[PDB]
Amino acid sequence: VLFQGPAMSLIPRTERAAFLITPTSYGKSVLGAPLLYFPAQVESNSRGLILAGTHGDETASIAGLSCALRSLPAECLKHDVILSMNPDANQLGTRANANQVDLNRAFPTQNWTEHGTVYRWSSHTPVRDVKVKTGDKEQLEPEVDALISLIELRRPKFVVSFHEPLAFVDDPAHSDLAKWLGKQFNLPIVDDVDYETPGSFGTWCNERQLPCITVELPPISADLTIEKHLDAFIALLQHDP
């Protein structure tokens, strides 16, 4: 290697409480909060979508993505960013939205059904047994409906979605983007996990041929996320795949 590639130049730390990009609303939550995204600032053929907050209690990734976004000069942002697609679940401290619907079981995939499912209470609980709803067959959850119209409208080339706490990069298709992510975040890659489950966002994306990678952080606090992984998020925000 001939020289270390340059350090990213960043908004000064002292200025980082501000958002220099005014977000645009793409909808309204069940409780009536606005759903927000920060539009990409660079024109390019590989503009995609970086997303967090599918599950309202997986917040280390929301904090890391928000800190990264506010650390990046505004004109460097290559992708649309949604800090949280489920704002009600964030203020309720729940995995599910305000109707007790797991939004990752609520996309209208071909195999979607109305029967509920169960999620795991905490990472060391031996079984998944917390009952959770998967949606109404007549009407999408508004956070789902809204994310779907946004993707229709903006056409990202890919989505990277952040979760916790499974500690892996979930790759739908042996792809370089997933390898690059595993190296950035120092996490192992697994191949094709939950891309067939009724209503998962990965299932939904595969049906549309949309590359969708999920990065599952380990169970780490927001503070450790900022201190260990800030650069990995910032890199991602500027990354060409």
Distance CA 7, CA 44 (A): 23
Q: Is 207 annotated as a binding residue?
A: no
- Closest to its own copies by CB, 15 or 240: 15
- Minimum distance from residue 118 beta carbon to its own copies (Å): 7
Contact residues: Zn ion, CB under 5 A: 55, 58, 163
CB 107, CB 97: distance < 8 Å: no
* CB 116 to its own copies: min, Å: 9
Active site residue 216: yes
Residue 19 near residue 81 (C-beta atoms within 8 A): no
Residue 87 binding target from its own copies, Zn ion, none, CB below 5 to 8 Å by type: its own copies
- Encode 167-216 in three state secondary structure: CEEECCCCCHHHHHHHHHHCCCEECCCCCCCCCCHHHHHHHCCCCEEEEE
Q: Which is nearer to its own copies, 76 or 226 (CB)?
A: 226
Contact criterion met (CB below 8 Å) for 76 and 42: yes
Selecting among 141, 143, 164, 216, the annotated active-site residue is 216
Binding site residues, its own copies, CB under 8 A = 13-19, 29, 31-34, 36, 52-53, 57-60, 62-67, 83-84, 87-88, 90-96, 100, 118-119, 121-125, 129-132, 164-165, 219-224, 226-227
Determine the Cα–Cα distance for residues 5 and 128; give it in Å rounded to an integer. 45
Min dist CB 191 to Zn ion, Å, is 18
Known binding residue 58? Answer is yes
Write the DSSP assignment of 126-149 as a string of letters.
SSEEEEEB--BTTB--HHHHHHHH
> Of Zn ion, its own copies, none, which one sits near residue 223, judging by CB under 5 to 8 A according to partner kind?
its own copies
163 binds, among its own copies, Zn ion, none (CB under 5 to 8 A by kind): Zn ion
**Residues with a known catalytic role:** 216
